[PDB]
Amino acid sequence: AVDPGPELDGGDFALPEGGLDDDRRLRALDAVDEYLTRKRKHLVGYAATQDMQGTALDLARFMPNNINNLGDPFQSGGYKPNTKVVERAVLDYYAKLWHAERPHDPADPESYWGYMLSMGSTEGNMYALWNARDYLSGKALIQPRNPNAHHPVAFYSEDTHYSFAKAVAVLGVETFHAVGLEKYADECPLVDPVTGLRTWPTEVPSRPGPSGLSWDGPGEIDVDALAVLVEFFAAKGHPVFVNLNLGSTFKGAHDDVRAVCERLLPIFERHGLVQREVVYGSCPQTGRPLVDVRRGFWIHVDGALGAGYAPFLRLAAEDPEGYGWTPEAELPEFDFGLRLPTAGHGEVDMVSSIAMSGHKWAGAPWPCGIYMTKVKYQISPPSQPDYIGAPDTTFAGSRNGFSPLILWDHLSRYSYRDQVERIREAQELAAYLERRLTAMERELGVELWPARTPGAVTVRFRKPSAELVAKWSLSSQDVLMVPGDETTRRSYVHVFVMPSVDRAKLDALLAELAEDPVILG
Amino acid sequence: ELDGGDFALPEGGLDDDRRLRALDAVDEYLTRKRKHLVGYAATQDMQGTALDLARFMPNNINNLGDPFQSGGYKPNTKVVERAVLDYYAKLWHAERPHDPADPESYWGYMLSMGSTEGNMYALWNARDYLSGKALIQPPRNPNAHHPVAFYSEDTHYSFAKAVAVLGVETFHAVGLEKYADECPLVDPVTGLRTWPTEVPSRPGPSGLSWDGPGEIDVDALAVLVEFFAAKGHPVFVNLNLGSTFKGAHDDVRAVCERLLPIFERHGLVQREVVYGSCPQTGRPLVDVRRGFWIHVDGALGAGYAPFLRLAAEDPEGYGWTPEAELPEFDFGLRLPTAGHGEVDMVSSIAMSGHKWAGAPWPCGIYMTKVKYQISPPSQPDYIGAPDTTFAGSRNGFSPLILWDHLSRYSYRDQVERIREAQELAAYLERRLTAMERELGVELWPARTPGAVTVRFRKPSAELVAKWSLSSQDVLMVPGDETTRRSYVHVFVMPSVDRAKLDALLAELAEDPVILGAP
Ligand SMILES: *[C@H](N[C@@H](CCSC)C(=O)OC)c1c(COP(=O)(O)O)cnc(C)c1O
Ligand SMILES: *[C@H](N[C@@H](CCSC)C(=O)OC)c1c(COP(=O)(O)O)cnc(C)c1O
Numbered sequence A: 001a002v003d004p005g006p007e008l009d010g011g012d013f014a015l016p017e018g019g020l021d022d023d024r025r026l027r028a029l030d031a032v033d034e035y036l037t038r039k040r041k042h043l044v045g046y047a048a049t050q051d052m053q054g055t056a057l058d059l060a061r062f063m064p065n066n067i068n069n070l071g072d073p074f075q076s077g078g079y080k081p082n083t084k085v086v087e088r089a090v091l092d093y094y095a096k097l098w099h100a101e102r103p104h105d106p107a108d109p110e111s112y113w114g115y116m117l118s119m120g121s122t123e124g125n126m127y128a129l130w131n132a133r134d135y136l137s138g139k140a141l142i143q144p145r146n147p148n149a150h151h152p153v154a155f156y157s158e159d160t161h162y163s164f165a166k167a168v169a170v171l172g173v174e175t176f177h178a179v180g181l182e183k184y185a186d187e188c189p190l191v192d193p194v195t196g197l198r199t200w201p202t203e204v205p206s207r208p209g210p211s212g213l214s215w216d217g218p219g220e221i222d223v224d225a226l227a228v229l230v231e232f233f234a235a236k237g238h239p240v241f242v243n244l245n246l247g248s249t250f251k252g253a254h255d256d257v258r259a260v261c262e263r264l265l266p267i268f269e270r271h272g273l274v275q276r277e278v279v280y281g282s283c284p285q286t287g288r289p290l291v292d293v294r295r296g297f298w299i300h301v302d303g304a305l306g307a308g309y310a311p312f313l314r315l316a317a318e319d320p321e322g323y324g325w326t327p328e329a330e331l332p333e334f335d336f337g338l339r340l341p342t343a344g345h346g347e348v349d350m351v352s353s354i355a356m357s358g359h360k361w362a363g364a365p366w367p368c369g370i371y372m373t374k375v376k377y378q379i380s381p382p383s384q385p386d387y388i389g390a391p392d393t394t395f396a397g398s399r400n401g402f403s404p405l406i407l408w409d410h411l412s413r414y415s416y417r418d419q420v421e422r423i424r425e426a427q428e429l430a431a432y433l434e435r436r437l438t439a440m441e442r443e444l445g446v447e448l449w450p451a452r453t454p455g456a457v458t459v460r461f462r463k464p465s466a467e468l469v470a471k472w473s474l475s476s477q478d479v480l481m482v483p484g485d486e487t488t489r490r491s492y493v494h495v496f497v498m499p500s501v502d503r504a505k506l507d508a509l510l511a512e513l514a515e516d517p518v519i520l521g
Numbered sequence B: 001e002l003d004g005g006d007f008a009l010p011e012g013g014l015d016d017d018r019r020l021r022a023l024d025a026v027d028e029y030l031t032r033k034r035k036h037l038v039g040y041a042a043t044q045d046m047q048g049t050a051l052d053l054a055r056f057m058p059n060n061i062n063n064l065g066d067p068f069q070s071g072g073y074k075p076n077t078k079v080v081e082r083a084v085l086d087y088y089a090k091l092w093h094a095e096r097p098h099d100p101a102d103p104e105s106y107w108g109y110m111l112s113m114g115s116t117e118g119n120m121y122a123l124w125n126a127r128d129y130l131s132g133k134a135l136i137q138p139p140r141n142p143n144a145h146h147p148v149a150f151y152s153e154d155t156h157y158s159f160a161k162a163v164a165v166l167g168v169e170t171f172h173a174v175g176l177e178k179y180a181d182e183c184p185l186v187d188p189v190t191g192l193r194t195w196p197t198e199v200p201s202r203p204g205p206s207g208l209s210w211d212g213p214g215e216i217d218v219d220a221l222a223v224l225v226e227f228f229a230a231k232g233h234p235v236f237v238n239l240n241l242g243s244t245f246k247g248a249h250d251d252v253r254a255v256c257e258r259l260l261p262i263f264e265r266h267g268l269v270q271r272e273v274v275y276g277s278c279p280q281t282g283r284p285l286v287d288v289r290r291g292f293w294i295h296v297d298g299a300l301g302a303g304y305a306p307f308l309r310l311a312a313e314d315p316e317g318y319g320w321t322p323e324a325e326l327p328e329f330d331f332g333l334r335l336p337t338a339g340h341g342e343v344d345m346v347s348s349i350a351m352s353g354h355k356w357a358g359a360p361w362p363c364g365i366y367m368t369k370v371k372y373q374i375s376p377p378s379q380p381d382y383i384g385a386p387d388t389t390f391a392g393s394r395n396g397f398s399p400l401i402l403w404d405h406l407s408r409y410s411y412r413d414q415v416e417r418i419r420e421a422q423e424l425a426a427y428l429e430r431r432l433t434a435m436e437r438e439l440g441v442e443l444w445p446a447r448t449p450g451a452v453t454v455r456f457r458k459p460s461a462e463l464v465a466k467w468s469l470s471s472q473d474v475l476m477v478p479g480d481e482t483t484r485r486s487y488v489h490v491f492v493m494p495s496v497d498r499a500k501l502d503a504l505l506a507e508l509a510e511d512p513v514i515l516g517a518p
Helices: A022-042 A053-062 A084-097 A121-137 A163-171 A176-183 A223-235 A257-270 A310-318 A403-413 A416-444 A466-471 A503-513 B016-036 B047-056 B078-091 B115-131 B157-166 B171-178 B218-230 B252-265 B305-313 B398-408 B411-439 B461-466 B498-509
Strands: A112-117 A153-155 A240-245 A276-282 A289-294 A297-302 A353-357 A369-374 A458-462 A475-480 A489-496 B106-111 B148-150 B235-240 B271-277 B284-289 B292-297 B334-336 B342-344 B348-352 B364-369 B453-457 B470-475 B484-491
Touching: A022 B047, A022 B398, A053 A403, A053 B016, A053 B047, A084 A112, A084 A369, A084 A403, A112 A121, A112 A403, A121 A163, A121 A240, A121 A297, A121 A353, A121 A369, A153 A176, A153 A223, A163 B157, A176 A223, A223 A240, A223 A257, A240 A257, A257 A297, A310 A416, A403 B016, A416 A458, A416 A503, A466 A503, B047 B398, B078 B106, B078 B364, B078 B398, B106 B115, B106 B398, B115 B157, B115 B235, B115 B292, B115 B348, B115 B364, B148 B171, B148 B218, B171 B218, B218 B235, B218 B252, B235 B252, B252 B292, B252 B334, B305 B411, B411 B453, B411 B498, B461 B498
Parallel strands: A153 A240, A240 A297, A297 A353, B148 B235, B235 B292, B292 B348
Antiparallel strands: A112 A369, A276 A289, A353 A369, A458 A489, A475 A489, B106 B364, B271 B284, B334 B342, B348 B364, B453 B484, B470 B484
């Protein structure tokens, strides 16, 4: 029944051979602004902070510059209009926040290395899986018999973002499902809870909900299931890549990164994956191959969303009196500071890489973010281009040097305490939304199927009318309540409570939901 | 330079005074550098852009999903993105509108990185298309599924990267692995049949490629492509349209004319491809595809080459005859088959928006045809649009940047932009040789005919850093480190005018490395 307002008309934007005069140009740009302004003020269905007035005022001045952070962030290079000094400051801030070792130092293998992304976290996850594929397969690093030793196998939950399926295909990294079907067809160690057959699942199971199946579960990886699957492949001699979701796309779940690491480390130690000799190439002689020592596992944290707020929630959890807030749910230790003891290898720093999107929690006018790892994992670049004056250590070639300014400006405006307040208000407002949806069910006698994983900044509920979805940019997901059976489909939407989503905005949405024709029935 | 101390981000934040001081320091640095940058292919003037588009800075714009599909993230500029894509589709003689039911119609999208993304996407798309992975759903030979990649020694480093990312095998790798003693080319330095690492570029006065024009040697390419095509391999060829260091244009028309008969001889125009078996039986399912893919890396040159070719076709109408011929390169390039049919030769093009047009961050275009589209890696509900692109979230500000640029200029204005740059590149070359004679020094100036860049001897570090001159070392005899020469180049972009070049030249004439030249 509500009005999402008119879309843009392509006729206004057609670019003729002769160009457009100033009046037609301004009319078009005004139409874009009127559209974008209406939509941004009502967007509540995606993990995208929408308020950036301060940014715009501070940084509009930089638009006349063709900024390019071409090459590694830790060398200027020949393209002098670059913001690498700013990029390093932003990377340093997140390195501290994620308990990485600073400063970056190419002679310190344990120190951080990372760079700012020109796409979103899609670039960071692609880079992670490239870096891990090469590291685990034995390609040469920047610093100097088992048939499966150079055949890595990827593991991640059913709540993992579609970017991984893409990245897996781009990079030719094999999932445990693919390798299971190919080489180990009848040896799946898990029993399917629907069919009772030992069929290889397509992703690692996520935890079950009230249904006994994952569709209504919290969206967290099932650690038991993961450990069974990892043991299976590690015992066969495969190196192991694990992606863990810190703020999953639809449910905002946090995989229990510490629990996963505690479970898997003994498996890694049992199967010789903590420290192992790796043959990297060869050359003609009496002998042949070169050799170095590497770990045989790689744990990546997809923190596209959650790496931006989780450190601040955990700060409050550590000092609840000081911040005046005890978070409702525990968020798992997930970062470069996570270190575990072993039987005979000393303490092991468990996480190899993290990705974060800057346009999610912080907010930006275009996609950006961070990939971070450690110097000891850096792969030799694919080539040595003279013409950029800095090593080609990154996924992108030319790199966005405006995004460093965006994030620097954001981070400079807020103290740690202010950042804690932002995640507090969002957590409290997500809880409020869930409370209001169940109250609506009782007031109106309607089913909304509301759900919210404890500690998540998103709430899911029954999809309303198409018009309401379009007004508020609600993101949609269908689930089959019993996998395989198309008659059990439910359509959900979700709301992401970002720092730009306040009580008034949620109350306005709720007032419209209460009068929506699909909701009423 | 900028001092990192001014930029460190404390736990407690920075106050408004420290914040403004830092941002002022950045602006002062960037402003000084941008006004003197002449060494990279990056248009530096965008005052109009800034005035028109700063207003959009408050929006978290996201063009998530396919440009031609509705999606749930409503603060998007896909209507604008499609207008930009339509403009370049026309400019590159693609078929419009995009229509998923028309195999011949264009498909493309705007890049969130630069052309690195477009070249990566091209090679991904070609790898899957040539290997037999499943195509997008509309509304014997042991080498058949092993594509081999070919490109010249002047190809940008993004290809070496993309090859490694995507696991695409170059002719050099396949040659060493499978055909170690069968290289059909003789090395001009050693006289041995050693597989070269890239397809040779054309020789210069030296007899070697270092002082050549930077264009692919079409003969050498044809010999190499025939070799692998006769073995049953499908073929990926990348052609440079405005190469990175020399600004050369591979002769795409000549390449296509040379290669088509080779493709016909070895059954690569129409090739039965097995893309798995049916869900019931192990019956190899098959459709018909071409067995070659020609990609044009027009990072730079796809932005200006159409306009120069416009003038070449009507020189009295535009008041300009370009001195150099630029090759036909685009989606309109169609050649006759042996049977007097026609074949559209080019499969894809990439362009960077931050090169010829100018942008405040990297952006660009990848374009192909609907008939080449691969089935998406998965089908996510939560964007509401197919995942058909390299990026996930996508930059929806870049469409505004390029739309604003393109809306400001007529075809005639765009012709004038490339005219002026061509004429100024020729002027710069004239001035450098005049300087050699006046000062009695060797500057090694070189300009490939039709290029917007001129190379010369590397001057002092100070001058290099002031004018952001890009540097390249060459070995004048490959493998001999004693023959190293250090060059720089100047790119004459639309924001490079005569005054700027004359100011550079005045400094070069008093430069200590130039004057101290042995
Ligand atoms: C990002 N997920 C959302 C992107 C739009 S909201 C700013 C999404 O897919 O919702 C439909 C995301 C990615 C990919 O990051 P990009 O920045 O889009 O490239 C990866 N991993 C997770 C967990 C995400 O949420
Ligand atoms: C881009 N080449 C230059 C990028 C800096 S100038 C804006 C370069 O390498 O500088 C010396 C280029 C690419 C890659 O495009 P990106 O936009 O950098 O990702 C690919 N192909 C060619 C021919 C290029 O020139």
